[PDB]
């Protein structure tokens, strides 16, 4: 039987790593991309389809779920896995990020955040994630807005570290959760090296199963994000997974792996898929464009997904233009599959010591 949590690194190249996270509900191949489940569903996909794309784990947003059906109700119904029909690992977010993003009349304090649906404390967040039956639980933090002054970034980071300790204690106080789930801490500090160091030190002292880099992908742009990752990731414990929250575009993922990131999530493949954007190895295309109206080729010429085996650009163009549900289904399946194929190529190239070459080849073609 698999352990609660075991991260093993099988191969390395520079700062990049490939390996596995073993958990009770399954094995996660790293670097990993986690499709996002909002409101207990990866939009427009049955869980079996999500698995068919290659996903080992999904991210469950807790924000909508804690509102409806409610964490308690989901617990009564047997937990999130049973509820939505996904039996593999689920990483849940804390709910606090989207509270700041989607709620109104929010009021912050040292205790937590109070909000009106469109009080969430570290303790309540951990409890909600428990009630959902989360496999990987995120500490409740505060994502510092960008740009931030050094003073405000420091104050925000310091609060987040206090909340990280509270998250740790709440998690540990619940026997069933502590024995069956894992807990990740989140590094803050904006773009400031000294604050990032203090945050990493605080998190490592508390001790977590994995470490996220927070406070990025919030408007700073790729150059600045990469610059911050350059010094921030080496501050985290090497022997634990590194999770870059909310990232991202294919090129962002490749660059982040080059800098030591092991885990990713974003709504981009799902959300932009329903909007008409399809990822290809020659860069993204918008299937709504009239140039695809009679194009019999698949979305991507090399993609192994079921959509590219069966349907043409012309048909998917028609579906998206017509507002048909099947359009969203096909675009989303392809995009998630593309992301998983990207992760597989990344893992294989690191394992073979040719990831640097892959990154170069990928960029040359993707941006040709």
Binding of a second copy at residue 118 (CB under 8 A)?
Answer: no
Judged on CB neighbours under 10 Å (0-12, 13-18, 19+), 363 is middle
- Phi/psi region, residue 84 (left: phi>0; alpha: psi -120 to 50; beta: rest), is alpha
Binding of Zn ion at residue 336 (CB under 5 A)?
Answer: no
Nearby residues of 264 by Cβ (< 8 Å), 6 or more positions away: 31, 32, 33, 34, 243, 244, 247, 248, 253, 256
Exactly one of 27, 67, 218, 326 binds ligand SAQ (CB under 6 A); that residue is: 218
Tell which positions 81-100 bind a second copy, by CB under 8 A: 83-85
| Min dist. Cβ of residue 11 to ligand SAQ (A) | 28
Interface pattern 310-339 for a second copy (x via CB under 8 A)? xxx-xx--xx-xx-xxx-xx----------
Of 51-59, 88-96, 281-289, 329-337, which part binds Zn ion (CB under 5 A)? 329-337
Tell which positions 171-190 bind ligand SAQ, by CB under 6 A: 186
Task: List residues bridging with 210 in a β-sheet.
Answer: 184
Pairing of strands 285-286, 277-278: antiparallel
Exactly one of 10, 14, 73, 291 binds a second copy (CB under 8 A); that residue is: 73
Of 57-65, 161-169, 211-219, 253-261, which part binds ligand SAQ (CB under 6 A)? 211-219
| Min dist. Cβ of residue 77 to a second copy (A) | 6
Which residues carry a binding-site annotation for Zn(2+)?
Answer: 303, 305, 308, 334
| Min dist. Cβ of residue 246 to ligand SAQ (A) | 2
> Which one, 138 or 305, has the nearer CB to Zn ion?
305
Given a contact cutoff of 8 angstroms between Cβ atoms, the answer to whether 264 and 256 are in contact is yes
Exactly one of 40, 153, 305, 342 binds a second copy (CB under 8 A); that residue is: 40
Binding of a second copy at residue 292 (CB under 8 A)?
Answer: no
Is residue 211 helix, strand or coil? strand
From the list 209, 262, 265, 300, the catalytic residue is 265
Binding of a second copy at residue 51 (CB under 8 A)?
Answer: no
> Which one, 213 or 331, has the nearer CB to Zn ion?
331
> Which one, 310 or 365, has the nearer CB to a second copy?
310
Q: Which of 181, 199, 182 is closest to 190 using CA atoms?
A: 199
Binding of a second copy at residue 44 (CB under 8 A)?
Answer: yes
Pairing of strands 136-138, 16-23: unpaired
Sign of the C-alpha dihedral, residues 262, 267, 273, 276?
negative
Given a contact cutoff of 8 angstroms between Cβ atoms, the answer to whether 343 and 32 are in contact is yes
| Min dist. Cβ of residue 266 to ligand SAQ (A) | 6
> Which one, 89 or 246, has the nearer CB to ligand SAQ?
246
**Residue 361 annotated in active site:** no
Exactly one of 83, 97, 355, 366 binds ligand SAQ (CB under 6 A); that residue is: 97
The Cα 185–Cα 16 span in angstroms is 21
Binding of ligand SAQ at residue 163 (CB under 6 A)?
Answer: no
Judged on CB neighbours under 10 Å (0-12, 13-18, 19+), 309 is exposed
From the list 93, 252, 262, 300, the catalytic residue is 93
From residue 340, alpha-carbon distances to 9, 22, 43, 155, 264 in Å are: 19, 19, 16, 38, 11
**What DSSP designation does 35 have?**
-
> Which one, 90 or 303, has the nearer CB to Zn ion?
303
> Which one, 243 or 315, has the nearer CB to a second copy?
315
Judged on CB neighbours under 10 Å (0-12, 13-18, 19+), 343 is buried
**Residue 348 annotated in active site:** no
Count the helices and strands in the chain (H runs, E runs): 16, 16
Binding of Zn ion at residue 334 (CB under 5 A)?
Answer: yes
Cis peptide before 75 (omega within 30 of 0): no
Q: Contact residues for a second copy (CB under 8 A)?
A: 39-41, 43-46, 64, 68-69, 73, 76-78, 83-85, 293-294, 296, 310-312, 314-315, 318-319, 321-322, 324-326, 328-329
Q: Which residues are catalytic?
A: 93, 265
């Amino acid at each position: 039987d698999r352990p609660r949590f075991s991260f093993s690194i099988a191969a390395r190249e520079g700062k990049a790593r490939t390996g596995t996270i073993e958990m009770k509900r399954g094995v996660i191949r790293t670097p990993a991309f986690m499709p996002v489940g909002t409101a207990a569903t990866v939009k427009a996909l049955k869980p079996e389809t999500v698995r068919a794309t290659g996903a080992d784990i999904i991210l469950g947003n807790t924000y909508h779920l804690m509102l409806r059906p409610g964490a308690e109700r989901i617990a009564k119904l047997g937990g999130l896995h049973s509820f939505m029909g996904w039996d593999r690992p689920i990483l849940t977010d804390s709910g606090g990020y989207q509270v700041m993003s989607l709620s109104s009349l929010t009021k912050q304090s040292e205790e937590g955040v109070t909000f009106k649906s469109h009080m969430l404390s570290p303790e309540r967040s951990i409890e909600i994630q428990h009630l959902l039956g989360s496999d990987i639980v995120m500490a409740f933090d505060e994502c510092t807005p960008y740009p931030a002054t050094p003073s405000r970034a420091a104050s925000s980071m310091e609060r987040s570290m206090r909340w990280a300790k509270r998250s740790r204690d709440a998690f540990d106080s619940r026997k069933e959760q502590a024995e069956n789930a894992a807990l990740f801490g989140i590094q803050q500090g904006s773009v400031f090296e000294n604050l990032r160091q203090q945050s990493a030190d605080a998190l490592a002292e508390i001790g977590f199963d994995g470490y996220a880099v927070g406070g990025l992908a919030v408007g700073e742009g790729q150059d600045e994000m990469f610059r911050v990752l350059d010094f921030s990731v080496p501050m985290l414990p090497d022997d634990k997974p590194h999770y870059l929250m909310g990232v991202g575009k294919p090129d962002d993922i490749v660059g982040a792996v080059e800098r030591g990131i092991d885990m990713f999530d974003c709504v981009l493949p799902t959300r932009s898929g329903r909007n008409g954007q399809a990822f290809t190895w020659d860069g993204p295309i918008n299937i709504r464009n009239a140039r695809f109206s009679e194009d019999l080729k698949p979305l991507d010429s090399e993609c192994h997904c079921a959509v590219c085996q069966k349907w043409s650009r012309a048909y998917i163009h028609h579906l998206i233009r017509a507002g048909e549900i099947l359009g969203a289904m096909l675009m989303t399946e392809h995009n998630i599959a593309f992301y998983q194929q990207l992760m597989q190529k990344i893992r294989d190239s690191i394992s073979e010591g040719r990831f640097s070459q892959f990154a170069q080849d990928f960029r040359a073609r993707y941006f040709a």
